[PDB]
Amino acid sequence: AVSKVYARSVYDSRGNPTVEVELTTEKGVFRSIVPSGASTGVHEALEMRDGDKSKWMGKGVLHAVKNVNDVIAPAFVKANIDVSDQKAVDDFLISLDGTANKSKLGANAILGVSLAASRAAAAEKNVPLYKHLADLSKSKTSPYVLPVPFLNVLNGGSHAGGALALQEFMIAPTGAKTFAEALRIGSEVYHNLKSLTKKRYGASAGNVGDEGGVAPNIQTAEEALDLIVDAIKAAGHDGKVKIGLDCASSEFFKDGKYDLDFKNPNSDKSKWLTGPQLADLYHSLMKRYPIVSIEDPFAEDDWEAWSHFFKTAGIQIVADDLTVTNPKRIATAIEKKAADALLLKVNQIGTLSESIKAAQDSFAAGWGVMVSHRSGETEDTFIADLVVGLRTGQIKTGAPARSERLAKLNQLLRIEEELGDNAVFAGENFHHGDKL
């Protein structure tokens, strides 16, 4: 029986405020901290920030904390909602807000109460959290699937200062036989990556971006993929570790063309490339490197380049800014056959039922779901139980560095050991880990 929903302001991996909600019931206090940070797409639940420039640079969430305390709680206490019924909870929160992108109370005020309730529901059913989330989404639980972690090792977009235009370079130990082995293989690769990084670029290049990867002054994509294969080669794991790229292409789409060299801004124009010319640079890279996932190859509204590259891509194609975890953008994405995996960011839709709901429609269309983090994360490991309950087989939770990252890798370590014989590692079936 919820007796108190309360909220406070706390900080995120970037020293920026975020909302922390603790919900009380006859079994204790359950908490949740809302992730934050953006690259962000236009059709997503909206986050409420103070805007006062003389306090936290205008990013406090004091308001968002007021909506929780002042609006949601007294209302939520009086409803007498069964937290076990997550839809009841979320429908209640949506009802109270009444906008389509949650701009009334704020997607941060809403999410925090929506996730705290799922923890409380599990406390109460007496099953570990990943087990409830498995109940809520109706996933096989025979056995559970531990995911391949796509680890960010190197960054290059608006996030690094050389000419490199692709944003994230990720490694995936799909070759491993257990989660624990994938994580170990993954950090030996990373650690080597840093050493080579500091010899070649200088000690300055060893510093890390927000997600834990390094951001050396690299000039070409090839130049970056080569540093990662040397890093995989030196760690002694050639053939067991794969790559994944997040090109964040919306970033360099201009005039119907893609500028592989922005950051100028003496923008050479004639080297700019059409969907199809870029489609030829990705096939190049695909043949020379062990690339198995490409996230956002084309821009958020460039549907025909998506549909035309996917007809022959033969690899996993992820949509992040093209679908903004919006079930209405997912569905077009699906009728146009524009990709085959969705990046799910629960705070992009703002509620747990709506999240679980998107993965489900992505699954029924033959798609995969890479559960993912945000730029500004917290010590909350909610997404570890979530890639385990949805049984997706793959998770992007940063590099094996900065603990807002490792707080989730560590939780997958504990779940794996906990499940004993009841867990299989996705491995190479990362794509459809749900169908295993």
Residues known to be catalytic:
211, 345
Binder of residue 173, out of Mn ion, its own copies, none (CB less than 5 to 8 A by kind): none
375 binds its own copies (CB under 8 A): no
Nearer to its own copies, 190 or 298 (CB): 190
Are 338 and 367 in contact by the 8 Å Cβ rule? The answer is no
- Is 262 among the residues that bind its own copies (CB under 8 A)? no
Residue 160: contacted member of Mn ion, its own copies, none (CB under 5 to 8 Å, by partner type): its own copies
Can you tell me the distance from the alpha carbon of 407 to that of 405, in angstroms, rounded to the nearest whole number?
Answer: 5
Q: Is 212 helix (H, G, I), strand (E, B) or coil?
A: coil
Say whether residue 238 binds its own copies (CB under 8 A).
no
Contact 345, 325 (CB under 8 A): yes
Type of residue at 45:
A
Measured from the CB atom, the residue of 48 and 215 that comes closer to its own copies is 215
Q: Which of 202, 256, 276, 314 binds its own copies (CB under 8 A)?
A: 202
Closest Cα to residue 186, out of 224, 241, 141, 228? 241
How many angstroms separate the CA atoms of 6 and 72, rounded? 9
Which residues touch 90 (CB under 8 Å, ≥6 apart)?
114, 351, 352, 353, 354
Q: How many CA atoms lie within 13 A of 336 on its CB side?
A: 21
Residue 37 binds Mn ion (CB under 5 A):
yes
**Partner interacting with residue 246 (select from Mn ion, its own copies, none; CB below 5-8 Å by kind):** Mn ion
Task: Give min distance, CB of 228 to its own copies, in A.
Answer: 16
373 labelled ligand-binding: yes
Query: Could you tell which of its own copies, Mn ion, none binds residue 355, using a CB distance below 5 to 8 A set by kind?
Result: none
Q: If DSSP codes are grouped into helix, strand and coil, which group holds residue 95?
A: helix
Residues of this chain, 177-196, that bind its own copies according to CB under 8 A: 183-184, 187-188, 190-191
**Is residue 1 close enough to count as binding Mn ion by CB under 5 A?**
no
Task: Give me 38's structure tokens.
Answer: 């953006």
Interface size with its own copies, residues (CB under 8 A)? 50
Axis-axis angle for helices 129-137, 107-125 (nearest 10): 110
Residue 168 assigned as binding residue: yes
Cα–Cα distance, 289 to 226 (Å, whole number): 8
Spatial distance between the Cα atoms of 345 and 37, rounded to a whole number of angstroms: 11
**Binding site partner of 157, from Mn ion, its own copies, none, Cβ cut-off 5-8 A by kind:** none
Q: Of residues 174, 351, 378, 394, which one binds its own copies by CB under 8 A? A: 378
β-strand pairing of 168-172 with 144-146: unpaired
Nearer to Mn ion, 350 or 389 (CB): 350
Place of tokens 């969705």: 342
Q: Is 361 known as a binding-site position?
A: no
Closest separation between CB of residue 95 and its own copies, Å?
A: 30
Is 354 near Mn ion (CB under 5 A)? no
Report the candidate in 340, 309, 350 with the shortest Cα–Cα distance to residue 430. 340
Straight-line distance from the first to the last Cα atom of the chain, in angstroms, rounded to the nearest whole number? 37
Shortest distance in whole angstroms from residue 276 CB to its own copies: 31
Dihedral over alpha carbons 196, 198, 202, 206 (to 10 degrees): 140
What is the spatial distance between Cα 177 and Cα 110, in angstroms, rounded to a whole number? 39
Q: Decide if residue 233 touches its own copies (CB under 8 A).
A: no
User: d(Cα 433, Cα 436) in Å, to the nearest integer?
Assistant: 6
| Residue 295 is labelled as binding a ligand | yes
Out of 9, 16, 39, 158, which residue is the one contacting Mn ion (CB under 5 A)? 39
Measured from the CB atom, the residue of 191 and 308 that comes closer to its own copies is 191
Largest pairwise CA distance in the chain: 66
Task: Give me the least distance between CB of 255 and its own copies, in Å please.
Answer: 25
Q: Is 38 in the site for Mn ion (CB under 5 A)?
A: yes
Angle at 233 between CA 214 and CA 171, to 5 degrees: 45
Near its own copies by CB under 8 A: residue from 15, 51, 98, 366: 15
Binding-site residue numbers for substrate are: 159, 168, 295, 320, 372-375, 396
Binding-site residue numbers for Mg(2+) are: 246, 295, 320
- What are the residues binding its own copies (CB under 8 A)? 8-16, 20, 54-57, 160-161, 183-184, 187-188, 190-191, 202-205, 207-209, 212, 214-215, 217, 236, 377-379, 399-404, 406-407, 409-410, 413-414, 417
- What are the residues binding Mn ion (CB under 5 A)? 37-39, 246, 248, 320, 374-375
